[PDB]
């Protein structure tokens, strides 16, 4: 089956043996590593190069920003997948992952299978317009309305009655339920 | 006439006088203002507090980051209004600082009544959806469209019809448009 080698990948913890591990293992994977250890430090390595990561990880408990808002800056500001690493794995932990931006999480201990997958939010087997920012508010509301109507069943019109946000689209909504569909299905 | 007192203002330049002039004028038409001297540091000031700042006023150059670049991360991706402080009034200069996202520009020595109008840009005397972000490719795609047919005189179709960007709609090009009109008509 197919395999995308040589992804880039940002991983984000302030615990050296967390990154330890996730470093060791998708070199393993064959993706390419870069160590931070700081959000704010993560945030200026990510604006210093658009177009330099596929994929993010950071830990849901950094030590100069609250876990969750640094989810929000990449994940929904910036518009880059970013995966939450947690020990905590809690129904509201795992919830609020996905409401603050990430498009999925790995869970303490990672096994390497999970870890090895991340390539499936960033490539896929088959001068552009203004991109959509999502505010987390916005998000937050969408999030609701798909786990209110199903994941399965959820239809951007539907989802949209549901939000009821003027000017909001059924293509905004279809181009973003494509982005979170994963992690909403594992709720 | 109506004055709107009381706007934030980050002023953000390596040169200590330049500072201390924009600041203390600043200060005289009863703005708030913070004042920073890194782009690295005026840029994770701005995401620490969304909503935090009505205008920001930067060098043109950066001892840690292009100046243009920096233009380009607050006027664009971050969609804040950002003033180019420049000691070089070449029209080549003056071109690239609304080229990189700038809304407005302030020449060496700055006059008070220049300085004092930057409010703008910010306010006027009359849960939403997802915001628009423009690339600086598209951005220049647009002004030189805009500036191939005169700014008085460009419609969004005909802007369209130059930029020549399937999925831009005219919406687009009008809003934009507004943000750039007073720059475009200084040219």
């Given at each position: 089956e197919m395999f995308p080698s040589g992804l880039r990948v940002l991983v984000v913890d302030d615990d050296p043996t967390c990154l330890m591990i996730l470093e060791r293992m998708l070199r393993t994977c064959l993706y390419e590593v870069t160590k931070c250890n700081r959000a704010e430090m993560a945030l200026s390595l990510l604006r210093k190069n658009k177009?330099?990561?596929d994929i993010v990880i950071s830990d849901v408990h950094m030590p100069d920003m609250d876990g969750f808002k640094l989810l929000e800056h990449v994940?929904?500001?910036?518009?880059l997948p970013v995966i939450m690493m947690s020990a905590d794995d809690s129904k509201s932990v795992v919830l609020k992952g996905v409401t603050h931006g990430a498009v999925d999480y790995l869970i303490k201990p990672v096994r390497m299978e999970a870890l090895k997958n991340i390539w499936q939010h960033v490539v896929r087997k088959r001068l552009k317009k203004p991109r959509v920012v999502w505010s987390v508010e916005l998000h937050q509301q969408f999030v609701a309305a798909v786990n209110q109507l199903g994941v399965e069943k959820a239809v951007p019109k539907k989802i949209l009655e549901l939000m009821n946000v003027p000017g909001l689209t059924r293509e905004n909504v279809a181009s973003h339920l494509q982005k979170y569909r994963i992690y909403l299905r594992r709720l």
């Open positions: 177009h330099g990561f994940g929904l500001e910036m518009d």
